[PDB]
Amino acid sequence: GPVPSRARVYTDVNTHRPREYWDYESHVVEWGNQDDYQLVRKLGRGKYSEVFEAINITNNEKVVVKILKPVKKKKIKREIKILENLRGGPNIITLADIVKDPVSRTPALVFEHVNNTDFKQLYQTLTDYDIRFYMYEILKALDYCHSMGIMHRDVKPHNVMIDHEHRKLRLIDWGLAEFYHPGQEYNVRVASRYFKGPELLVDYQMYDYSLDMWSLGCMLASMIFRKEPFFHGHDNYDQLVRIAKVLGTEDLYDYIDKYNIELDPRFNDILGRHSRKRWERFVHSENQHLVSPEALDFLDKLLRYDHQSRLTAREAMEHPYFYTVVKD
C-alpha cells in the first residue's frame, strides 16, 4: 500500500491542545440575538450557503451574514469551531456572532465586513509590489492557521478578500478547513479544480498543511504570469496532465513512487511524456514587469509535486521575494 506521510511542521499541535480545541463535534454553540441583524443585500451563493450584506442595528455597522444550507451538524460545528479558534489571528476573517436564522432554521454566521473589489479586475491592476505585499499578507494568515493546527484546503483568489483602499486582506470561507492530525486520512475532494494539489489529483489521502502551499503557488503563477487560471484543466484528470506538461512526467513518477502511489490507469492514454519546463518560457512582454529571479525561484519552491518538499508558510516568508516589501 501507499507510504504514510507527516507534516514537516506543526505536526503535533492538536495532540497537545486540550481535546475541546479540535473536538468540534462536542462544541456547544452560543447563540446571539438574530434581531440584531437586518439583511440588506445578497452577495452570492456558496454550494453550502447564501451570503448577505447586513447591518448590525446595535451599532449601525455593516456586517456579512453567511446563512448555512442544511449540511451535517458536524460540518457546521467544524467551520464554527475553526473560526472561533482562529479569531484574532493575522488576516483571518473575524466571526463576530452566530445566530439562528428564522427562515432557514439553520445557523447564520456573522462576519466583519470587508470592502473588496472582485479579483478579476483587481488582479488586472496589481503591480509587482502589490503582488509581493498581498502574498506576504496571505502567508501571515496561512502560517497562523497552520500553527494553530488547521489547514484551509480551499485557497483560491475568491477566498482572499482585499480592500485595496486600506491595503486590507482577509482569508475567508473556512467551510472546507480541517484540523490536522498526524496519520489521518482526509477527503481528497477539496479545493477548486485549478488549485487542487497533486496529492489530491493522485488520490493520496494523508496530506497536510502543504496542500495550501500548492494552492498559493497556483495563485502566484496566475498573478505574475497574468494567466487565469494558470493550470487550466477541463476536469480532474486533465488538471494533472496540465501540471505534468509544466513540471514534467519523470518527477511526477518520482513523486508517486516515493509514496508507493499507483497512478489511476485512466492516465495511461492521456498523460504522455513531458520534460520539466523552465519558468522563463511563461514570461513575455506583457507580464515581465511582474517577474524577477526572486519571483521565479519562490514560485518554483511552492509548486513541487512532493508535498513534503514545498516551502512552509514560515519558510516562504523568509524568501528574498519579500525583501522589498515594507515590514511593520
Ligand SMILES: COc1cc2c(cc1O)cc1c3c(cc(O)c(OC)c32)CCN1C
Ligand atoms: C466577508 O465579506 C464577504 C464574504 C463572502 C462574500 C462576499 C463578502 O463581501 C461572498 C461569498 C462567500 C462565501 C463563503 C464565505 O465564508 C464568505 O465569507 C463570509 C463569503 C461563498 C460565496 N459567496 C459568494
